[PDB]
Design a protein around this ligand. Structure first.
Ligand SMILES: Cc1cc2nc3c(=O)[nH]c(=O)nc-3n(C[C@H](O)[C@H](O)[C@H](O)COP(=O)(O)OP(=O)(O)OC[C@H]3O[C@@H](n4cnc5c(N)ncnc54)[C@H](O)[C@@H]3O)c2cc1C
Ligand SMILES: NC(=O)c1ccc[n+]([C@@H]2O[C@H](COP(=O)([O-])OP(=O)(O)OC[C@H]3O[C@@H](n4cnc5c(N)ncnc54)[C@H](O)[C@@H]3O)[C@@H](O)[C@H]2O)c1
Ligand SMILES: NC(=O)c1ccc[n+]([C@@H]2O[C@H](COP(=O)([O-])OP(=O)(O)OC[C@H]3O[C@@H](n4cnc5c(N)ncnc54)[C@H](O)[C@@H]3O)[C@@H](O)[C@H]2O)c1
Length: 450
C-alpha cells in the first residue's frame, strides 16, 4: 500500500472496475489503485442468482464459470488475476496499471487533504478519487431481534460466499423460504425451484405485496408473473406480513400477522439494500434524504477531485431528473463515465443505462428509464391494451408479449420490454426524444405489437 497514488478507487465491485478500465483507456499511462473491503478481486454479481445455478458442471461452485445466453462460457471475474500489478509495484512499474488492495476498508476521508485512512492505520493521498462502495443487504427486524438459533438459519445474499453456502444448503435441507418479492427474492426463488424439482424438495416465497415485483410492475402484470414463478415449483404466499420467527423442535417457524404459521429449514432474506454511505460522515459529503446515497451532480461529481458511481450514487439526470439506480449495467455506465471525467472529460450522464431479469423460460424482460409501479402506466400486448393508475386492466388475460410505458405528463419516462428482444435501441430513442405522444398504440408499433 503506497502513501500516494494518482487515481484512488474506493470499493472493489463493478463500478470501480469499469472506472479503472476507462481511465486506462483515456490515459494509457495511468496509475490506479482499488482499495477493496472484500478479499475477492472484482466480479460481476448477476450470475450468482441466475446462470451459476443452471450449470450442468458439478464443479461450478469451485470453477465459477458460466454460460452466457449465447453459448460462450466465461468466468465470473472481470479479468484474470495475472492482469493486475502489485500494490507495492504500482509507483514504479513502467506504463502503470491497475492494483487491487484486497481486504482493507476505508474508514475515514479527509476531503481537504485529499487523503483516506484505512482500518489498519495506513494513509493514502490521491489526486482523483471515486467512491464506489455499493450497498449492504437490509435485514428484517423480526430476525434481527431473535436468537442465535434463528440467526444461524438465516442468509443475506450478495457475495460469492453466499452462493456457496446457499447452494450447499439447497442440497441438504427439505424446505427453504425466501422472504421478499423484489429482484433478488424472485430470481432466487426460480433458481431454487428448478433445483428442488430434481429432489422433490420445497421452496416457499412470501412477501407483503400482492405479487412479485410489486414496486416495479403494474398489478396485472405482477400477478401474471407470480403465476409463472409458481410454475417453477415455488409455493408463493403473497399478502404475508411476518410477525415473528423462532425455532420449534429444530425447525424454523415463521408466524404471520394473519395467524398462519410457516415451517421451514432455512430462510433467505431479500428485502432491499442500504447504500454504503459511512464515509459521508467524516468526509462531510451531502447525503440525499429522498433517494439515499451520496448526492452528486450530472457529471457524478461531489466535490472537486471526488466522484461517486454505482449503487451509492444519487445523481442528476438532465433528461429524467434526480435518481439513484441499483443495477449491474448502471454500475458499468456510471463507473465508465466517472473514469472519463476523472481524466478531464467533463461529460454529463446521457447514455441511459438499462436492466434485465428472468424468471423461468416465460418471463424475460428488459427495461430503461424511471420504471416505477407508482407511476401511471399504459401497456400494449399481443392480446389486450391495458391502462393503470383502450381500457382498464383485466387480470387473468394473456400477457406473454408487450411493451409497458411509464408516464409523466404525456412524456414516456420509462419503458419495459416484455418478452421482446432486440428493440432496446428504440426504447432509448423514445426516452431521449421526450415527446408528448398522442396515441401510444402508435408508439407501440415500433416494437412489433400487433
Ligand atoms: C445476486 C445479485 C444479482 C444481480 N443481478 C442483476 C441483474 O441480473 N441485472 C441487473 O441489472 N442488476 C443485478 N444486480 C446488481 C449488480 O449486482 C451490481 O453490482 C450493483 O447494482 C452495482 O455494483 P457497485 O460496484 O456499485 O457496488 P458493489 O458491487 O456492491 O461493490 C462495492 C464494493 O465496495 C466494498 N466496500 C464497501 N465499502 C467499502 C469501503 N468503505 N472501503 C473499501 N471497500 C468497500 C464492498 O464490500 C463491495 O465489494 C444483482 C445484484 C446481486 C447481488
Ligand atoms: N435482475 C435484477 O435487476 C436484479 C437481480 C438480483 C438482484 N438485484 C439487485 O439486488 C439488490 C437487492 O435485491 P432485493 O430484491 O432485495 O431489493 P428490492 O428492492 O428489489 O426488493 C425490495 C423488496 O423487499 C421486500 N421488503 C421490503 N421490506 C420488507 C419487509 N419489511 N418485510 C418483507 N419484505 C420486505 C419487498 O418485497 C420489496 O419489494 C437490488 O439493488 C436489486 O436491484 C437486481
Ligand atoms: N439483454 C439481456 O437480456 C441481457 C441478458 C444478460 C445480460 N445482459 C447485460 O446487459 C448489458 C448490455 O446489454 P445488451 O442488451 O447489449 O446484452 P447482449 O449483448 O446480450 O445483447 C444482445 C441482444 O441479444 C438479444 N437476445 C436475443 N435473444 C435473446 C435471448 N434468447 N435471451 C437473451 N437475450 C436475447 C437481446 O435482446 C439483445 O438485444 C451487458 O452488461 C450484458 O451482460 C443483458
Amino acid at each position: 500500500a503506497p502513501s500516494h497514488v494518482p487515481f484512488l478507487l474506493i470499493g472493489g465491485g463493478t463500478a470501480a472496475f469499469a472506472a479503472a478500465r476507462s481511465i486506462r483507456a483515456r490515459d494509457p499511462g495511468a496509475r490506479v489503485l482499488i482499495v477493496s473491503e472484500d478479499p475477492e478481486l472484482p466480479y460481476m454479481r448477476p450470475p450468482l442468482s441466475k446462470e451459476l445455478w443452471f450449470s450442468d458442471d458439478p464443479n461450478v461452485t469451485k470453477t465459477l464459470r458460466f454460460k452466457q445466453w449465447n453459448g460462450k462460457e466465461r468466468s465470473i471475474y472481470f479479468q484474470p488475476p495475472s492482469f493486475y500489478v502489485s500494490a507495492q509495484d504500482l509507483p514504479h512499474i513502467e506504463n502503470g496499471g491497475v492494483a487491487v488492495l484486497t481486504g482493507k476498508k476505508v474508514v475515514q476521508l479527509d476531503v481537504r487533504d485529499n487523503m483516506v485512512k484505512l482500518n489498519d492505520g495506513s494513509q493514502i493521498t490521491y489526486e482523483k478519487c471515486l467512491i464506489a462502495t455499493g450497498g449492504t443487504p437490509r435485514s428484517l427486524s423480526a430476525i434481527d431481534r431473535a436468537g442465535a438459533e434463528v440467526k444461524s438459519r438465516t442468509t443475506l445474499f450478495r457475495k460469492i460466499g453466499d452462493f456457496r453456502s446457499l447452494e450447499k444448503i439447497s442440497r441438504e435441507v427439505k424446505s427453504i423460504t425466501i422472504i421478499g418479492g423484489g429482484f433478488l427474492g424472485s430470481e432466487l426463488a426460480c433458481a431454487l425451484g428448478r433445483k428442488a424439482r430434481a429432489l422433490g424438495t420445497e421452496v416457499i416465497q412470501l412477501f407483503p405485496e400482492k405479487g412479485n415485483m410489486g414496486k416495479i410492475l403494474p398489478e396485472y402484470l405482477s400477478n401474471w408473473t407470480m403465476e409463472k414463478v409458481r410454475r417453477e415449483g415455488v409455493k408463493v404466499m403473497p399478502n404475508a406480513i411476518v410477525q415473528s420467527v423462532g425455532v420449534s423442535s429444530g425447525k424454523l417457524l415463521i408466524k404471520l400477522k394473519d395467524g398462519r404459521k410457516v415451517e421451514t429449514d432455512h430462510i433467505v432474506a431479500a428485502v432491499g439494500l442500504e447504500p454504503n454511505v459511512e464515509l459521508a460522515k467524516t468526509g462531510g459529503l451531502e447525503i440525499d434524504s429522498d433517494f439515499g446515497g451520496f448526492r452528486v451532480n450530472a457529471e457524478l461529481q461531489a466535490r472537486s477531485n471526488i466522484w461517486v458511481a454505482g449503487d451509492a450514487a444519487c445523481f442528476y439526470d438532465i433528461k429524467l431528473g434526480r435518481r439513484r439506480v441499483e443495477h449491474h449495467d448502471h454500475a458499468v455506465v456510471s463507473g465508465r463515465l466517472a473514469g472519463e471525467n476523472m481524466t478531464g472529460a467533463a461529460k454529463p450522464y446521457w447514455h441511459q443505462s438499462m436492466f434485465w431479469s428472468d424468471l423461468g423460460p416465460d418471463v424475460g424482460y428488459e427495461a430503461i428509464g424511471l420504471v416505477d409501479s407508482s407511476l401511471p402506466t399504459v401497456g400494449v400486448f399481443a392480446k389486450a391494451t391495458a391502462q393503470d393508475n383502450p381500457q382498464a386492466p383485466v387480470q387473468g388475460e394473456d400477457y406473454g408479449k408487450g411493451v409497458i410505458f411509464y408516464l409523466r405528463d404525456k412524456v414516456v419516462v420509462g419503458i419495459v420490454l416484455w418478452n421482446i428482444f432486440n428493440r432496446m435501441p428504440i426504447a432509448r430513442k423514445i426516452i431521449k426524444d421526450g415527446e408528448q405522444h398522442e396515441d401510444l398504440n402508435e408508439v407501440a408499433k415500433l416494437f412489433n405489437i400487433h
